[PDB]
Amino acid sequence: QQLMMILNSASDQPSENLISYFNNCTVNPKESILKRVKDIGYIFKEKFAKAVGQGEIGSQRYKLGVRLYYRVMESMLKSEEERLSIQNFSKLLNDNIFHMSLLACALEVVMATYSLSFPWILNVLNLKAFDFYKVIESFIKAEGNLTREMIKHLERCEHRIMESFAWLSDSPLFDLIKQSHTAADMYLEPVSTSLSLFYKKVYRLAYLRLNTLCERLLSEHPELEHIIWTLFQHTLQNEYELMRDRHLDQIMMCSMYGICKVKNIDLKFKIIVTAYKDLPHAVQETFKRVLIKEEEYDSIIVFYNSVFMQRLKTNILQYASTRPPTLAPIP
């Protein structure tokens, strides 16, 4: 309540202390910051109306988001003023993607509070999930009045991007992969620390879920988990194209079934799927509707046979050889 209460009384404009930060820039970003907000207001309100249909609420949502945007900006730029050279600080303030991400995240907090939720705001602003993902942790750190429920919501957004959204076709992620840590650092990157940190968090997320299912399904073969994880991590690292337009948990379940298969262990997909459902956010569509080729979808069993196996045949077989591949680090 404390945050929304502040926003209802807060200024619609940048404070003088935030303007003071603007003045310290070699290239004064203020004019472009104000115009960006005004122009985004117009697009936001229209797309809002187009969404909800006929019936002011739209204008107030944007107004509150803008107020929070300026609040968190000022808070975030206090730390960054110490951390960045004069040149980079100016570069950050004139960075469109930084501002759009900061604004999107503020709008998401207001939308979710007065609940069209994630990822609706990304399509409104034409903003890639991977670019938005860069701001979340620093946003949370810069806004001390966020409620537990909102932090959890933003963390949920972050994890949805990590598990699916960042892997959609056209995602900037694949460009970074082809090539090869505050929000400011990651937006200052040219056209990788964004890549490194993203993968580290994905690995952490992925092992957590694998651990859970393994502990419930393969206790009598406890050797299996680390082996399954090595297949999982290797595939995320080296066969990343399998993730494109698909879901982290699909590669997880296939790695389990795949490893158990080549160990001659009876673990039906049916048993795997059933345990998956008890995962805190798990949704039956993830194993029922899996992309195969050129927009045709089927169950996970078909995906495993037609795509997963055919790409990873030689890889999985090594885990049954006399020289199985070296176990992967646990994150």
Curated annotation (Swiss-Prot):
<comment type="similarity">
    <text>Belongs to the retinoblastoma protein (RB) family.</text>
</comment>
<feature type="region of interest" description="Pocket; binds T and E1A">
    <location>
        <begin position="1"/>
        <end position="319"/>
    </location>
</feature>
<protein>
    <recommendedName>
        <fullName>Retinoblastoma-associated protein</fullName>
    </recommendedName>
</protein>
<feature type="modified residue" description="Phosphoserine">
    <location>
        <position position="189"/>
    </location>
</feature>
<feature type="region of interest" description="Domain A">
    <location>
        <begin position="1"/>
        <end position="180"/>
    </location>
</feature>
<feature type="region of interest" description="Domain B">
    <location>
        <begin position="192"/>
        <end position="319"/>
    </location>
</feature>
<comment type="function">
    <text>(Microbial infection) In case of viral infections, interactions with SV40 large T antigen, HPV E7 protein or adenovirus E1A protein induce the disassembly of RB1-E2F1 complex thereby disrupting RB1's activity.</text>
</comment>
<comment type="function">
    <text>Tumor suppressor that is a key regulator of the G1/S transition of the cell cycle. The hypophosphorylated form binds transcription regulators of the E2F family, preventing transcription of E2F-responsive genes. Both physically blocks E2Fs transactivating domain and recruits chromatin-modifying enzymes that actively repress transcription. Cyclin and CDK-dependent phosphorylation of RB1 induces its dissociation from E2Fs, thereby activating transcription of E2F responsive genes and triggering entry into S phase.</text>
</comment>
<feature type="modified residue" description="Phosphoserine">
    <location>
        <position position="328"/>
    </location>
</feature>
<comment type="subunit">
    <text>The hypophosphorylated form interacts with and sequesters the E2F1 transcription factor, thereby inhibiting E2F1 transcription. Interacts with heterodimeric E2F/DP transcription factor complexes containing TFDP1 and either E2F1, E2F3, E2F4 or E2F5, or TFDP2 and E2F4. Interacts (when hyperphosphorylated and hypophosphorylated) with PKP3; the interaction inhibits RB1 interaction with and repression of the transcription factor E2F1, potentially via sequestering RB1 to the cytoplasm. The unphosphorylated form interacts with EID1, ARID3B, KDM5A, SUV39H1, MJD2A/JHDM3A and THOC1.</text>
</comment>
<comment type="subunit">
    <text>(Microbial infection) Interacts with adenovirus E1A protein.</text>
</comment>
<feature type="modified residue" description="Phosphoserine; by CDK2">
    <location>
        <position position="171"/>
    </location>
</feature>
